[PDB]
């Protein structure tokens, strides 16, 4: 796995990724 | 209640303050088990309750000395858990507090001794605070504990701390060899297993705990190659489970240190077992097993009414599962 | 001492009347019927005076002793009834009963009610003193296997016709509660004078009032009946049983199963059963359990049981019943995706 | 004044009782055939008609015409029993009188013959509150009862009584009144009272009653007060929304369908009243666990959740198991992290947002 | 002199703030004449259960008649205001929880009222009664005498038996919103002739949650601190709340991934001596508010209007994943704060950790 | 007979207290303006002066001269309150009077008028230990007390009190005392007691106090007892087990280099010398924080540390910040779990062994 992901796992920080982006109602502008 | 030689200096300090009147009304002694803190507290109590002190020692013939010898001194109070119980309740603390208000029968000092402050419940610890902060005149409190950090912060802040340092390793080894006959390696291993505190090693040797340790070592030696860790249940399921779990954790730590490369190991009398453990297990699995063993020992010592057999069986099955390839290992976290 | 069942009590009473009668069991209906029969026979013999007392720590034994010692001007032939505690007699109760048995008279008829006595309770001075002049009637509730025959016989003696479906419904709804079942039969007879009890008729006037014990739940888990296990667990929760008792009862059998599964790799099952002192009747069900659960299982179950115990003990949580339901489904062959096992 | 609906509409005849046929028919047959037991016990939920049926039976026993299941209602005995002034009917509130000394005097009256009735009826209600000595005295009285006395017992906790007491009385268990019968009774009462109403309001009130007629009547009185002498759908819906306290299931349903606006509205409604956020999270976790168990086996859901059975069944049938597991894990993490959140409400909102839109990344 | 909470207890139905549905229902019931005999009031602390109960008692026992608008001037109204009315029996259930007291009370319910037309029992904290006490009230509560009324108030309704609940009409009071609390505070301060500022009142209203008693207590504390005045600076000092501008600037600096600005802000805060745990809490709150705004445009409240536009900018630029990462990092930092060598050291280390794992511009990798 | 410094130096006037300026100003303004509440609650950490301020307020309320924020300290009421034998000041120890019966008995006597003073003050200490029934019984009377009674509450865990109780009283939060304030107070006390001292000893004692003045006084008393009646830098350092030499720097360097043998040898030497493990962990955490700080900006390095600059800069340049964060997290975890390990040395060894694994 990626080094940064392993380090975050060791630090105990969980990473969240979008699953249903249609739920959000606004100009998120995630894509650039 | 043996009087060990290394208690000579510390006593000569503490009593000196009581001779000058510069004595704190709440003294907390930090010492490992088997260090003889109880003997020191008893000597201080005998000195305080003597009606005709001479030098730094009680006369031994006054009425106070006779009552202390008989063990029926009205002004001496002891707070210890009941015979069948394991914790000290709040009712005893309240009764002692209410009894302390009235004057002493013999018109002298009043001494209260808490056998172990770590066994106090939260309610008892909170109830003791007001009495401990502003005790009545000519009242002295003595408390003993292993880890002051486990005590309540408010209770801790009201006491004067005194720490007993274990003697040097060579002196302890010589004293143990004088007391009991055994090989040098066995004495050194027993001393190191007890965090360097003499008397605890003597307690291990005088009893049958050494045979139990040998049985556990043989069982682990059989289990490590085959991989059947369940068989250790019979060697661990006992009323003294925490000590055997500590021994197993020490063996695992020694194996891990040997893998990393070190000159000192706690278990110096069993090189073969630690060598086999290092050879047959990887560092990550050793760390995971050590963490699990420590956590289970803490749970057994802390939780009240927990079932020993179920916890040990679950631990052994979990270790066996961890030994399988491709299994995610635990990671420490807050 | 004679040993009898409720059906033979009337025959024994017709044969003759003894000095003391012991009624031990867990079925209120049978105990009440035996007591009523004995008291009716005694009244026929000329016992028109009856006294009842409850055995407990706060008991006035002086009144009982005075009753035994004192005579009667005209109302002789006294009858005394004792109700033992649920736990059972203790040393103080043992010596009190010994003293009472010492002061026994031909005109005093003694009856005792209570739960079944153990070997320690059986081996008592008072119990042995009555051995030569006592008859013990055993009143145990029949199991589900023998229940339908009992229901059919009881309906027959009341001049009623029960269909098979009606009998099954009655057994299911009133399992372990014979008093409720008898009252239900009486109410059905009242409702329908013709006595024709069909399935739709009985289904209207029946409610769920079953009674169970943790051993029934463990047996259901061993057999693998999810519906029965869930129903028993719900009934136990409604009653108000202590979860710790269920946890221990399940733990014993689960650890036994784990050990047997581990050591059965290179050993026949019969030898293991003999070595572990498994009762002959149970050896059947245990066998099929070992043919339904793998080594991968019986470890997740142990982990879940340990987690539930820790939550109950240190966390004082209230979700113990949900974890019990999850474990019950796990023991039966179900997916149990393990997100709820925390594995 | 207008009196209270619950008090005004006491069933004064066997025909006025709603449902409970399996009990009324048996009692009528027993009275007609003369098969009368010594002791009767009535059990059931609150507001199902135990006391009403007991009073009707007592009236029927001591009617001037005779022992009949259809009391005339016009003779002096019937009027006195209805007004509560009948000498031979002794009603005992066991809850108020529990000590043995109080019960002894009442039970010692069985040694006197009836004054103006065939039977001397004792109606003991809330009998489960008696003490052990009172139970012993009652058992001793019941062992040898005079032929001219009857005992009627009513309680909601029959398991509290000793088995000895239970084995000497015939027990009747009353059932819930069901939605349709409650609605019909409410419609009849409102028509008799000349109160305007609509079918939807009656259906909502009956559904909210939950098997109790007294609850239905109390809700009807409250709705009439809120509606200013009229029962309307909007007024009843608003009143029920005010008393609504099932935000957990609504939040679960809104979250499962990815409707953020509904989730925010439900959070605001929950915050309007005083609620514990951790309790709400625990309730949501329990609901998710129950849904998962129901998916594993249909028998998991019992009779304890009869009120919300349909919604739980629909959720179990529709939602895939994987989504349920994901939501359960997300809520577990949220509960774990709640103490360190800036605020309890903020923590709950963040966890609900994560469940709605985000998915955690697991190691390896 | 007199405490504001005790001085400003409502004495007429017009003085009650909010609770429109309950007041409307009570007024309709009184006007129509359909009066029950058992009322239960539920809600959170300091919402006006006791006040509404006393107003209902005044309406029932007023000399003019049974009306929804008590005069407030006759002898009965004044005595009820002073708590010296004979026919209003107020029971403190929290103190008298024993069944003996309940039996003594029930033994004297059939006697007629001394002067009023009704005898009103107001039982407070009824959730503390024992099980026997609860079961002893069932029959009397179900069928009381004609001239007896029961009023019950509690904050924990679910502890009552269902049998008790089925016998009474239930009214659930709802927590008050910020606008109503602020308006009430403005009115009270204007009547008291005390200077005030809008921002101080807004802060007090937001800090009081939905309880008016808490708002009045905070107002008294602020008046004491401000020496006869309610000023925004005094209230801010009392509540220990830092300016939102500084927290937003710190968040923006963290997002931009410029360590120098973050260190300068930390030094500036240390010069004043800003509480560090409060700083972390404020940053977490700002991040949560940004996430909520991303979820729904209307999530943002009015109190943040002064910075609203700025917030929106972040909602238009920062991906949700970055917001979640920052929130989680700050939450972990707060979790580990107590065990750090120093609070300042812990906060600095947390910010350095956040900068190191910046999604876009991490700190330079060593050669 | 002999009284410790903590008991002897209890403040007896509003001007004798250290810090807590906001609370004192609020109380003085309230007393001067005549706006006196009937329910005061004091919250804060341990040994910050909650009981002292409560007693001062009680003394000010019942002073013979009048309701003033500056009690005379010479009238009969002030002297009796100072001696703790004033009839109208009833002090309750809630830690031993948790029973609801005691609370009911206390409340039954509120109708009686005060004996001598103009107010009857109740000072409930450790109020967080009362049972739920006690709080519920209090609620009603606490809401509307008679005109001649006051309630003063002091607690260290306000979270445990129900919200209903908190809503009825004015709350005052006491901040933890700063290091400078504690040092100044200790210096003043020692000067008044005529005891020799050194600035560094006072600095170390204040740092070890951790915001509690009672703890500072206890440590000072221990140092005086163990230092032949004199406070000296060496005595305090020995008592607290100060690291002094750069053992922590060498240990962290060995850990970073992933040389297990060196780390174990250093740990064995430290154990033989008998140092405090908590101090070692704290020093290592401080060094890691400083190294992380230097990476962001070279000028961040302190001038007082101008003896190991080369090694610190080498570590900062050679180690990425992520590894520094990992090591900091590992040391924090080790510090958290240290008291729960079988031995302190065993816990330290476990932490170091876990940290040694973070190297490719
Ligand atoms: N089966 C029923 N038919 C008609 N009304 C009923 C019925 N059950 C309850 N009620 C109504 O509910 C009110 C209270 O019932 P109650 O006698 O208290 O029953 P319980 O004793 O089970 O609580 C009565 O005034 C009655 O009008
Ligand atoms: N709706 C309201 N309108 C006006 N004042 C209120 C209201 N609710 C609470 N208060 C204020 O709060 C104080 C305490 O209210 P209280 O009677 O204790 O309510 P509860 O019984 O719900 O705690 C009162 O003195 C009153 O000034
Ligand atoms: N603000 C302060 N000013 C001066 N001394 C203080 C202060 N706070 C605490 N102390 C000292 O600490 C000792 C104990 O304080 P105490 O009244 O117990 O506070 P708390 O009630 O918060 O524990 C006192 O004898 C006093 O000498
Ligand atoms: F009177 Al009921 F259930 F409330 F019988
Ligand atoms: F008096 Al309250 F909630 F505090 F009703
Ligand atoms: F910490 Al304290 F009284 F000793 F509040
Ligand atoms: Mg009833
Ligand atoms: Mg109130
Ligand atoms: Mg204090
Ligand atoms: Zn002597
Ligand atoms: Zn008639
Ligand atoms: Zn008026
Ligand atoms: Zn003075």
């Amino acid at each position: 796995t990626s080094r940064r992901d392993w380090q975050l796992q060791q630090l105990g920080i969980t990473q969240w990724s979008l699953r249903r982006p249609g739920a959000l109602q606004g100009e998120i502008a995630i894509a650039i | 209640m043996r009087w060990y030689p290394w208690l000579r200096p510390d006593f000569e300090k503490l009593v000196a303050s009581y001779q000058a009147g510069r004595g704190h009304h709440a003294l907390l002694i930090q010492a490992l088990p088997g260090m003889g803190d109880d003997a020191l507290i008893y000597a201080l109590s005998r000195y305080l309750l003597c009606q005709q002190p001479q030098g730094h020692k009680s006369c031994g013939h006054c009425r106070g000395c006779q009552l202390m010898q008989a063990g029926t001194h009205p002004d001496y109070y002891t707070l210890a858990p009941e015979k069948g119980k394991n914790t000290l309740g709040v009712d005893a603390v309240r009764e002692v507090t209410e009894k302390l208000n009235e004057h002493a029968r013999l018109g002298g000092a009043k001494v209260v001794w808490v056998t172990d402050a770590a066994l106090l419940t939260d309610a008892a610890a909170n109830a003791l605070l007001k009495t401990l902060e502003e005790p009545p005149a000519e009242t002295w409190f003595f408390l003993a504990t292993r880890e002051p950090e486990r005590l309540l912060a408010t209770l801790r802040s009201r006491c004067r701390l005194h720490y007993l340092a274990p003697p040097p390793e060579q002196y302890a080894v010589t004293w143990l060899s004088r007391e009991v006959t055994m090989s040098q390696d066995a004495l050194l291993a027993a001393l190191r297993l007890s965090a360097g505190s003499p008397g605890a090693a003597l307690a291990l040797f005088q009893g049958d705990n050494w045979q139990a340790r040998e049985t556990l070592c043989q069982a682990l030696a059989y289990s490590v190659p085959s991989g059947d860790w369940y068989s250790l249940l019979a060697a661990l399921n006992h009323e003294q489970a925490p000590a055997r779990l500590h021994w197993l954790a020490t063996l695992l730590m020694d194996a891990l240190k040997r893998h990393h490369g070190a000159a000192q190991v706690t278990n110096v009398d069993v090189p073969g077992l630690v060598a086999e453990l290092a050879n047959h297990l990887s560092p990550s699995r050793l760390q995971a097993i050590l963490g699990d063993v420590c956590h289970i020992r803490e749970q057994l010592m802390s939780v009240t009414g927990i079932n020993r057999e179920l916890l040990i069986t679950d631990l052994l099955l979990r270790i066996e599962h961890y030994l399988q390839p491709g299994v995610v290992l635990p990671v420490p976290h807050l | 001492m004679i040993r009898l069942y409720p059906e033979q009590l009337r025959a024994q009473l017709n044969e003759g009347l003894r000095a003391a009668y012991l009624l031990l069991g867990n079925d209120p209906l049978l105990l009440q019927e035996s007591q009523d029969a004995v008291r009716q026979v005694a009244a026929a013999q000329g016992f028109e005076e009856h006294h009842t007392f409850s055995i407990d720590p706060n008991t006035d034994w002086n009144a009982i002793f005075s009753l035994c010692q004192a005579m009667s001007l005209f109302a002789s032939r006294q009858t005394l009834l004792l109700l033992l505690p649920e736990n059972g007699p203790n040393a103080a109760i043992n010596e009190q009963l010994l003293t009472l048995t010492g002061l026994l008279h031909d005109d005093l008829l003694l009856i005792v009610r209570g739960n079944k006595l153990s070997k320690a309770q059986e081996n008592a001075a008072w119990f042995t003193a009555l051995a030569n002049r006592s008859v013990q009637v055993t009143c145990q509730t029949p199991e589900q296997a023998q229940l339908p025959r009992w229901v059919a016989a009881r309906a027959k003696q009341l001049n009623l016709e029960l269909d098979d479906a009606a009998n099954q419904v009655l057994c299911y709804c009133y399992e372990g509660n014979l008093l409720a079942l008898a009252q239900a039969l009486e109410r059905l007879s009242l409702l329908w004078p013709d006595g024709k009890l069909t399935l739709p008729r009985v289904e209207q006037a029946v409610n769920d009032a079953a009674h169970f014990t943790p051993f029934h739940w463990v047996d259901a888990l061993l057999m693998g009946k999810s519906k029965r296990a869930l129903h028993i667990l719900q009934q136990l929760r409604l009653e108000g049983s202590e979860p710790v008792i269920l946890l221990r009862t399940l733990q014993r059998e689960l650890l036994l199963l784990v050990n047997l599964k581990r050591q059965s790799a290179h050993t026949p099952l019969r030898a293991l059963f003999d070595k572990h002192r498994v009762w002959q009747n149970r050896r059947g069900m245990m066998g099929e359990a070992l043919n339904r659960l793998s080594q991968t299982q019986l470890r997740q179950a142990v982990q879940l049981l340990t987690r539930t115990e820790l939550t109950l003990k240190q966390d004082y949580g209230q979700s113990v019943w949900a974890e019990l339901e999850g474990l019950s489904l796990l023991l039966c062959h179900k997916p149990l995706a393990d997100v709820f096992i925390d594995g | 004044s207008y009196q209270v609906l619950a008090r005004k509409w006491r069933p004064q005849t066997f025909a006025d009782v709603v449902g409970q046929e399996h009990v009324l028919t048996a009692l009528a047959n027993g009275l007609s055939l003369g098969r009368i037991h010594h002791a009767y016990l009535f059990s059931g939920t609150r507001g199902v008609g135990k006391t009403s049926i007991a009073r009707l039976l007592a009236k029927g026993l001591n009617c001037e015409t005779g022992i009949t299941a259809t009391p005339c209602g016009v003779c002096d005995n019937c009027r006195e029993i209805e007004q509560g002034r009948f000498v031979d009917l002794i009603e005992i509130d066991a809850a108020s009188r529990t000590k043995v000394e109080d019960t002894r005097d009442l039970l010692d009256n069985v040694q006197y013959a009836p004054a103006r009735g065939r039977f001397k009826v004792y109606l003991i209600d809330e009998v489960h509150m008696l003490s052990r000595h009172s139970f012993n005295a009652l058992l001793k009285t019941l062992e040898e009862p005079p032929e001219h006395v009857k005992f009627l017992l009513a309680t909601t906790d029959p398991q509290k009584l000793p088995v000895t007491i239970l084995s000497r009385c015939l027990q009747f268990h009353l059932k819930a009144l069901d939605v349709e019968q409650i609605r019909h009774q409410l419609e009849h009462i409102l028509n008799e009272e000349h109160i305007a109403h609509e079918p939807r309001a009656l259906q909502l009130l009956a559904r909210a009653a939950e098997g109790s007629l007294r609850d239905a009547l109390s809700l009807t009185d409250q709705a009439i007060a809120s509606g200013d002498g009229q029962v309307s759908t909007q007024a009843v819906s608003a009143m029920l929304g005010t008393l609504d306290d099932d935000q957990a299931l609504s939040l679960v349903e809104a979250m499962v369908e990815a409707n953020g606006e509904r989730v925010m509205a439900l959070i605001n409604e929950a915050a309007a009243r005083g609620i514990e956020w951790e309790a709400l999270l625990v309730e949501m976790l329990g609901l998710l666990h129950r849904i998962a168990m129901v998916q594993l086996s249909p028998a998991a859901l019992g009779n304890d959740m009869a009120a919300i059975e349909l919604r739980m069944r629909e959720l179990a049938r529709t939602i895939p198991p994987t989504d349920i597991q994901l939501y359960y894990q997300t809520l577990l993490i949220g509960r774990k992290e709640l103490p360190y959140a800036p605020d309890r409400r903020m923590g709950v909102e963040m966890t609900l947002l994560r469940a709605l839109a985000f998915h955690p990344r697991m190691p390896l």
Side-chain angles (χ1 to χ4, degrees), chain C residues 23-71:
Chain C
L23 308 178
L24 305 177
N26 55 16
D27 189 2
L29 182 64
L30 295 171
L31 296 172
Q32 269 289 352
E33 289 181 352
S34 301
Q35 178 181 342
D36 295 1
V38 170
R39 280 196 168 184
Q40 287 179 2
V41 170
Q45 294 293 351
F47 290 75
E48 286 71 20
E49 181 173 354
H50 308 274
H51 299 268
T52 176
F53 296 89
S54 301
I55 304 304
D56 59 326
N58 181 19
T59 304
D60 191 334
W61 297 89
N62 299 17
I64 300 171
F65 300 151
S66 301
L67 171 57
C68 290
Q69 295 283 46
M71 300 181 181

Side-chain angles (χ1 to χ4, degrees), chain D residues 37-39 110 138-151 168:
Chain D
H37 296 62
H38 291 279
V110 302
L138 184 62
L139 178 59
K140 198 179 74 174
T141 300
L142 291 173
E143 278 177 358
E144 197 282 318
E147 192 63 16
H148 60 73
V149 311
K150 296 289 181 297
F151 293 91
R168 305 189 79 86

